[PDB]
Amino acid sequence: VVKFTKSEALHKEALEHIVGGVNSPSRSFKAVGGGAPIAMERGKGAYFWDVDGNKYIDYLAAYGPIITGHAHPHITKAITTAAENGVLYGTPTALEVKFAKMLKEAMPALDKVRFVNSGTEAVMTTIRVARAYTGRTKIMKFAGCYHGHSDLVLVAAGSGPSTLGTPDSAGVPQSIAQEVITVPFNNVETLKEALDKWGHEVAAILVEPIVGNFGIVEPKPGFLEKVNELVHEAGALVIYDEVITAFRFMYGGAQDLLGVTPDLTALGKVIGGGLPIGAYGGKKEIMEQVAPLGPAYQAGTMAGNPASMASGIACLEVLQQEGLYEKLDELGATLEKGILEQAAKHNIDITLNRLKGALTVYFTTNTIEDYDAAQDTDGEMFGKFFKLMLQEGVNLAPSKYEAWFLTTEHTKEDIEYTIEAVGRAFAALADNK
Amino acid sequence: MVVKFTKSEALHKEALEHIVGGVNSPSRSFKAVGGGAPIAMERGKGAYFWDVDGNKYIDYLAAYGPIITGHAHPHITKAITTAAENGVLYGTPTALEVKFAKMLKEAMPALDKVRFVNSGTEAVMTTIRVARAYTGRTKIMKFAGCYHGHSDLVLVALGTPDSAGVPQSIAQEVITVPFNNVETLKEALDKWGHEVAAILVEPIVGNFGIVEPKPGFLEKVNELVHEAGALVIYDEVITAFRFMYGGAQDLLGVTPDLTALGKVIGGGLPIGAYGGKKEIMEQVAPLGPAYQAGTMAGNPASMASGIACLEVLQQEGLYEKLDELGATLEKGILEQAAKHNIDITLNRLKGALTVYFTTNTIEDYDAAQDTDGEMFGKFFKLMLQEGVNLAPSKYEAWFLTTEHTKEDIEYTIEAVGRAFAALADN
């Protein structure tokens, strides 16, 4: 039996100074039955150590950014050098141009780019830019997809077919929600309906080209192609939110992987090497709306800072290695196979979506192709599974809507232990109900 | 002439092809000062910058506000390195978040609880959401010319926006009134007070130059706003830890309901935070229904960096020294203006100041906007030639750091005299 005594004490103290003891609700254990979240003291490659000295194989990847593992020495070197020369200037630098060019080389549809401080800021910006460019106000998005924590993307459907949004957070006015139309991911019919109905007032649609925010869910064949067709027909723009997808599945974005081109792209997470970052980019004429060139305002005190540029560069230099994404795919396939075998063995009902080195285990018999179905999977089962996995020394994200991410540092043996641990986790579930 | 920018010019030419307008903030373009390629910096150490052409500068930009320990202060550098070696981003709680949270609360006792985010802009937009959740109201009030980040609502000039791409539905939620003016404030709250969730205030303005609130003005803001049932948000993204070890609220002794923070408190790394009265903060998930998140929020690098920075700022005599040096600088600049017959007014608080080209006392945005931008731009470019790097706008502040010396100040004063001579010569 593992113990979490120090984490418990830390959480108790955290509650006094930080709202709910966490700086993101995602980090709370509320969704998985409560209790103190586990506090980590150190990460190295595939491993975490908590404040009680327990070791974990980590699949959280800090919710998407981590792919070179914790503290990869090539990135650490770059960060150290950056700190030694000052991490923040408020002026142009060579590194900004270098990193901009490297992103353009990997994702040839970016004609120009701008750096911001987060995926949230990147998305906020693409929206303002699409509105400035088209002269339109409304924004479309797919149900359940996450585009950061700005007011506009904190809106839900939509009572009835193709309707105006309702607020999905307190503090978000109906005046904001009124500008957003939400429709189901992977559904051509409803997309058609909404565009026929509102298409002429829609500045842009937001798309996770591959979904990572209600588990990993791939677009069906023809879907992204149809989004482009329908949205362009309507005079609207397509914004790919690639904050998760870019550099996660190949050296490049899902747009390069799947061969479908948006008008604008939002980036973040992986491209910072672990440091805070965002970027957006796309077709020349669209980007030229941004000040000082155009009238659309975007700024940010830490935007393009030398530390994040340096660590981002270092990270992509690592990801350039030949055979790297193929290894993630291989290990992912091994992991998928093993989890499915353990589920069959122990009569646990699961569905598993994997693309390369990212996967989600759902507790259900339904194949998950949209948010509605992910919502209806067994969160109570998932919660118990999550806590049993901790006991096995495997750190997952504490939500049924999260992905397991492999890194370049996970080994065959890491995966084989993980499978063993899942086997023991599933056995325990079987013995309780 | 003597100071050449060939390499900054070639780099800007390349940047233009890849980055919109060649900069990642419009602040960094030389657009406000007559145009041209901005100076690209290669490294910073203490009070000094070196550009890509090898030219050395005494820096007053402070990266528009966060820099106060100078560039690459060793105490911060070691923290950032240690953090990188131990992993910079976890996505779980850590002991460092709790430690830094306590330090902020210790410096600024009106924070019952705090949350970390990734930028001042995020901290500001969150305080608005929280204010709206708490009061159940939608309108936000702010002062003309003040800057609160680059989220839609605060980019509005009912009101009407000044950024393209910001819808009328947003502008209708914003009311804007002149800074330092009690009558227009009362008048706005009388009409719209019952729909106003909060007012946003830079308790000491930094964004149309440095401008202090008139005597009694902040207390009047609290008085009129609270009686309308609205909350007061201090946007202390610039002010906190700039003027004393604590916020403008601690310095001026006036307490808001919510506070947004950033810039200084990250030691240079990207950061924001917000906090305030316990009951209000209870709205934030997972405690309440007001959502706020952020993948790098509370990251161990930014936490360790912030802690290291506040540790430097705890040293006895540090803020006094910044004040004393600021006084010397102000005194020298005023003497040079008198000597060369240049019309300026100078607003200083502690180690931050703005030189305005005008004869008017500057107390609000309207006045600042009227000052002579042409003369500022010439002055700015003459200063570069003297090896002094300022922020390229008349709306900017000069910021001292712990690393600027009496000799740096003396040199800057003589640089200013040389530049004022050239302005007078014409």
UniProtKB/Swiss-Prot annotation, chain A:
N6-(pyridoxal phosphate)lysine modification, residue list: 269
Compartments in which it is found: Cytoplasm
Superkingdom of the organism of origin: Bacteria
GO CC annotation: cytoplasm
Protein EC: 5.4.3.8
Predominant subcellular localization, coarse grouping: cytoplasm
Gene Ontology MF annotations: glutamate-1-semialdehyde 2,1-aminomutase activity; pyridoxal phosphate binding; transaminase activity
Catalytic reaction list: (S)-4-amino-5-oxopentanoate = 5-aminolevulinate
InterPro entries reported for this sequence: 4pyrrol_synth_GluAld_NH2Trfase, Aminotrans_3, Aminotrans_3_PPA_site, PyrdxlP-dep_Trfase, PyrdxlP-dep_Trfase_major, PyrdxlP-dep_Trfase_small
CDD domains: OAT_like (cd00610)
Pathway named in the protein's UniProt entry: Porphyrin-containing compound metabolism; protoporphyrin-IX biosynthesis; 5-aminolevulinate from L-glutamyl-tRNA(Glu): step 2/2
GO terms under biological process: protoporphyrinogen IX biosynthetic process
Gene3D superfamilies: Aspartate Aminotransferase, domain 1 (3.90.1150.10), Type I PLP-dependent aspartate aminotransferase-like (Major domain) (3.40.640.10)
Keywords: Cytoplasm, Isomerase, Porphyrin biosynthesis, Pyridoxal phosphate
PANTHER family (UniProt xref): GLUTAMATE-1-SEMIALDEHYDE 2,1-AMINOMUTASE, GLUTAMATE-1-SEMIALDEHYDE 2,1-AMINOMUTASE 2
Assembly and oligomerization: Homodimer.
UniProt cross-references to NCBIfam families, sorted A to Z: hemL, PRK00062.1, PRK12389.1
Protein family according to the UniProt entry: Belongs to the class-III pyridoxal-phosphate-dependent aminotransferase family. HemL subfamily.
Protein name according to UniProt: Glutamate-1-semialdehyde 2,1-aminomutase 1
Species, as recorded: Bacillus anthracis
